[PDB]
Design a protein around this ligand. Structure first.
Ligand SMILES: *C(=O)[C@@H]1CCCN1C(=O)[C@@H]1CCCN1C(=O)OCc1ccccc1
Length: 710
């Protein structure tokens, strides 16, 4: 297996930092600098041993070809109306980036509106955010290069798809909202910083400001409408009310589902948007989330979690703002999470609920909050929707582990609502009938029942002989719901695998209580939940530790890496994608400061104590038992991942290779693959996606010696 030698990596034994009396050495701290010749050489040497290992087993070629075939199917988004025209995204099958089409009529012939594919040879320039003007005659869109979060906003005139000269730079984590007068658009921008701003830098992002750009002018003329010099981490996103009268400002600090809500009655501005707006601080604290749904005059309907962990809808009247006066339009459910709400056809509300990690869709009346219609859906997730206040119809996209996805449409003007299939594509190759998805609830260490989805071929023997791929995230109120993955189904069909997704704490599956159940002092709950999920699959005979693979990305990357350190005996293979590995320094880079709401910060003595116990980078240790070694490990990252700076994986792999790799008993490989012209994941071209999943399953195939099944 290991027919190579790990690269010689220098250890700076003098790099020792004090954390409230706790001294920690950081010998690979030099890897934090992406531009040095030393780090560049480290990356080059790592990939030099990783690549040949991945490409050696012919299985990679078989998987790649099979993925190219199965992934080649029509992928559409929901149709959405803007002005007098309809729009929808569409990928014929293997295009690197999906294309935006336009058609003047629902029955009319569509034409390409914007094709990101012609902007680069390798499809590494992608659309990241967009917003049409209220009348739908002007379009603003963001473009990111090589997977970076940095955006450049460009403009177009819809009629004739004419390119405009307006160009906005230094845009990141930005809103995009046109004022209804059609004069300009609000957006967020960061101050000028030394060094690079292309996604390879590690520089922290602070002092984000809200600007307003007048169409037809240079960015230098942009009006500063809001800023927080005393609070560097505050981020203010703007949006216009459905009636265009109010600018709603949602200020966030961190990643908790909470925000301050300030508003500006545009009718009350002296003479238009000329500077800092006359903000009325309706909700001036970070105690709850207030998500704007719609308003009728001064009565604003918001989805909130204020003393409602599963979320509810409340009406706040600007003329009588006190909390005791707020009306509860749609009360919180005792268990089901209200994920999102949209207002359509003037007085209808589309409510989407998460019931035991499965979605439901319902139409409610705006005035009373009363349920009017239940849109029939199978076991899966709603991952697409269209229907604004002025629209008279809705489109919604449904998907599941076994179904590619069905797009439904419903004309809301009709007396009797008849929802119908608008678009449905099937993947000829993966016969859904041959598989089944079962949901179970297993007890974690403390007794808490945790949901887990298992996908496998029908009629398999539970004798523990099957390879398994267990996925998890566990954090930031993110719910891991059913989704169609061609890559995972190939593992099932062509590698005889068992798929599993553990809905561990930290996620939003059971509201804010579920979220708080996997954060700060209780982050260990996440790891414990996932480890118990692994034990469940083993105990119940779905797989065995030597046949088990665990995967996670970003916060899930931390999940799988930590689980490798804590229970190396439970897994055969671990694939950690773009993970947070250095829990003591994560807050120092790019947007890392925002994650402290989930992890805490090492600056605090109390937080450091939680963090030091699980930080992957600080817990690599040779297993005590002679018959126990670390499982095979593959860390995937990229040089433009400015969300989770690559240094996390660089320092981690260097530590794994030195501490564990050098031991005799370590026969399983510990590798890293750093991709070029790629970032955290969003906007990654189809070509790179296929290369990535091929590397993953080939690594698994080679390490567990799995035969490909034709
Ligand atoms: C992947 O899990 C990484 C590392 C841990 C958190 N995280 C993120 O990408 C988080 C959670 C999803 C969104 N996110 C994030 O940092 O978004 C940037 C941001 C935007 C607006 C306010 C604060 C942060």
């Amino acid at each position: 297996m290991l027919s190579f030698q790990y690269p010689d990596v220098y250890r700076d034994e003098t790099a020792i930092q004090d954390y409230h009396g706790h001294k920690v050495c950081d010998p690979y701290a030099w890897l934090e600098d992406p531009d040095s010749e030393q780090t560049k050489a480290f990356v080059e040497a790592q990939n030099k041993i990783t690549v040949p290992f991945l490409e050696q087993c012919p299985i990679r070629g078989l998987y790649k070809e099979r993925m190219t075939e199965l992934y080649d199917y029509p992928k559409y988004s929901c149709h959405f109306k803007k002005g007098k025209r309809y729009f929808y995204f569409y990928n014929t099958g293997l295009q690197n980036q999906r294309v935006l089409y336009v058609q003047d009529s629902l029955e009319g012939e569509a034409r390409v509106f914007l094709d990101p594919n012609i902007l680069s040879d390798d499809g590494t320039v992608a659309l990241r955010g967009y917003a049409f003007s209220e009348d739908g005659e002007y379009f603003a869109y963001g473009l990111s290069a090589s997977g970076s979060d940095w955006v450049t906003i460009k403009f177009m005139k819809v009629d004739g798809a004419k390119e405009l000269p307006d160009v906005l730079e230094r845009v990141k984590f930005s809103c995009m909202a046109w004022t209804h007068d059609g004069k300009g658009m609000f957006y967020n921008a960061y101050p000028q910083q030394d060094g690079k701003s292309d996604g390879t830098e590690t520089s922290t992002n602070l002092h984000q400001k809200l600007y307003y750009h007048v169409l037809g002018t240079d960015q230098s003329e942009d009006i500063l409408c809001a800023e927080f010099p005393d609070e560097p981490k505050w981020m203010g996103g703007a949006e216009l009310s459905d009636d265009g009268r109010y600018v709603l400002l949602s200020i966030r600090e961190g990643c908790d589902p909470v925000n301050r809500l300030w508003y500006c009655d545009l009718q009350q501005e002296s003479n238009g948007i000329t500077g800092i707006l006359k903000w009325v601080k309706l909700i001036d604290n970070f105690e709850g989330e207030y998500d704007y749904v719609t308003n009728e005059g001064t009565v604003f309907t918001f989805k909130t979690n204020r003393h409602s962990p599963n979320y509810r809808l409340i009406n706040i009247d600007f003329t009588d703002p006190e909390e005791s006066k707020w009306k509860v339009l749609v009360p919180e459910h005792e268990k089901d999470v209200l994920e999102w709400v949209a207002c359509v056809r003037s007085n209808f509300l589309v409510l989407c609920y998460l019931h035991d990690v499965k979605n439901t869709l319902q139409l409610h009346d705006l005035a009373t909050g009363a349920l009017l219609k239940i849109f029939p859906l199978e076991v899966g997730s709603v991952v697409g929707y269209s229907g604004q206040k002025k629209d008279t119809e809705i489109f919604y996209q449904f998907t599941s582990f076994l179904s590619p996805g069905i797009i439904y449409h419903c004309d809301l003007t009709k007396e009797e609502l008849e929802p119908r299939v608008f678009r449905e594509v099937t993947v000829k190759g993966i016969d859904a009938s041959d598989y089944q998805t079962v949901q179970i609830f297993y007890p974690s260490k403390d007794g808490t029942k945790i949901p887990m989805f298992i996908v496998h071929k029908k009629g398999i023997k539970l004798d523990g002989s099957h390879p398994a791929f267990l996925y998890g995230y566990g954090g930031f109120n993110i719910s891991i719901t059913p989704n169609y993955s061609v890559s995972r189904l190939i593992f099932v069909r062509h590698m005889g695998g068992v798929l599993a997704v553990a809905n561990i704490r930290g996620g939003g599956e059971y509201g804010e209580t579920w979220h708080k159940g996997g954060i700060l002092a209780n982050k260990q709950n996440c790891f414990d939940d996932f480890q118990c999920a692994a034990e469940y699959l083993i105990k119940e005979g779905y797989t065995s530790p030597k046949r088990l693979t665990i995967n996670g990305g970003s916060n899930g990357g931390l999940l799988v890496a930590t689980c490798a350190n804590q229970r190396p005996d439970l897994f055969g293979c671990v694939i950690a994608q773009v993970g947070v590995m250095d829990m003591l320094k994560f807050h120092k880079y790019t947007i890392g400061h925002a994650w402290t709401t989930d992890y805490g910060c090492s600056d605090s003595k109390q937080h450091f104590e939680w963090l030091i116990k699980y930080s992957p980078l600080h817990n690599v240790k040779l297993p005590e038992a002679d018959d126990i070694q670390y499982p095979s490990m593959l860390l995937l990252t990229a040089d433009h991942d400015d969300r989770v700076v690559p240094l996390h994986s660089l320092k981690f792999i260097a530590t794994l290779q030195y501490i564990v790799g050098r031991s005799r008993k370590q026969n399983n490989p510990l590798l890293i693959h750093v991709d070029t012209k790629a970032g955290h994941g969003a906007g990654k071209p189809t070509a790179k996606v296929i290369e990535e999943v091929s590397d993953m399953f080939a690594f698994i195939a080679r390490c567990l010696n799995i035969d490909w099944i034709p």
